[PDB]
Amino acid sequence: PRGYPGQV
Amino acid sequence: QTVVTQESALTTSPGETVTLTCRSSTGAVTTSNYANWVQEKPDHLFTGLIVGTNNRVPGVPPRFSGSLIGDKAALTITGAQTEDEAIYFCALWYSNHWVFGGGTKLTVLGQPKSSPSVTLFPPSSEELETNKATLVCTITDFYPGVVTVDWKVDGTPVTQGMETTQPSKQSNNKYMASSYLTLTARAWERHSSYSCQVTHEGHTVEKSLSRA
């Protein structure tokens, strides 16, 4: 998937 | 607008496979939407179940899984249990915003279904002296805990001035709710019949009273 820009 | 929609309510017996879905109004749900599923129990106890489409939060029972079904995100409970009666919300990461669905009330039957006991009360003389008139509709002992409440005055559906509580659990694990119709004393005097109509599992229980 297209990346999640949150802090994970 | 991005509108995320879920089934309003679903009912199951224990042991069944139940599938909840989560749709976007603006396009297909894909793994790029990192679909989340969260559970609310009473009262406002939230538990995260699934994140990133299909990642079970550690400690969540193995019967919960997430996937995609067609254009939608899905939560599957493989062998529903009575402890799974709750409201389930999805959230999608869509156009770089987290958007929540409206929630699905899931009933997992812990006891036989039960029709509502409905009581309608007229305004008190004491209240009428303040030039206000509240009618009170009490609704108890219903299961599943899902009802729709409608009011009519002399046959006219009421569209304004009525407030209904969300169902809450009784000590016997059935549910209760109350509804209010707020009128002026002048309105009370202009009308004769008043009715509270409660629909539960496709059947309507109506109670009425006359002012006179």
Next chain:
Amino acid sequence: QIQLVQSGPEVQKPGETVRISCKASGYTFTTAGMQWVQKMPGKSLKWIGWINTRSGVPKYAEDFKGRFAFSLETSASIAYLHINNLKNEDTATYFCAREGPGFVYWGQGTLVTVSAAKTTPPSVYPLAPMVTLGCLVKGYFPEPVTVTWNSGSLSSGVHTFPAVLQSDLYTLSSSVTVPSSTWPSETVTCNVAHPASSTKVDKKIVPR
């Protein structure tokens, strides 16, 4: 065990500010973002934004930007939600929830009620026609009230319903179902206490 514990319920006037804390434990605070979520009464959830716990950089949803702000006390593993210039419509339960992606572990929620109402005791009205009686507990502020029947002597068949917040004041009702042979033969009375105003009132239920 990962736990997020929030501060207690808040009652504030419009124009004031509220600050809610969210204390995290069971994991290293700076390794996951913290999100904040609003749930207005009886409605679904809205995402307020997140804050990066390593850099302190927040991301705010457009619908909350302005009066809503996030801060950290990193050394204490606490995240804060600040709401300035409060509006009646900010009345909601607020949740912190840890990343992610999304909302993995949730705080217990913090109720915030925004009202210009002064502390107000309820007006208590009898609800009269097994027979079901009740009392209407109208126009009080803030929560809670307690309702008993015959000073607690009548306990079976009592239902006290959740309050509705209406015109900056609360209303609820309580009912009791008694054998019809027993009322109005003997007296049935609703006792209503409102701790915030330090008031208690009894209302005997008489045929209408």
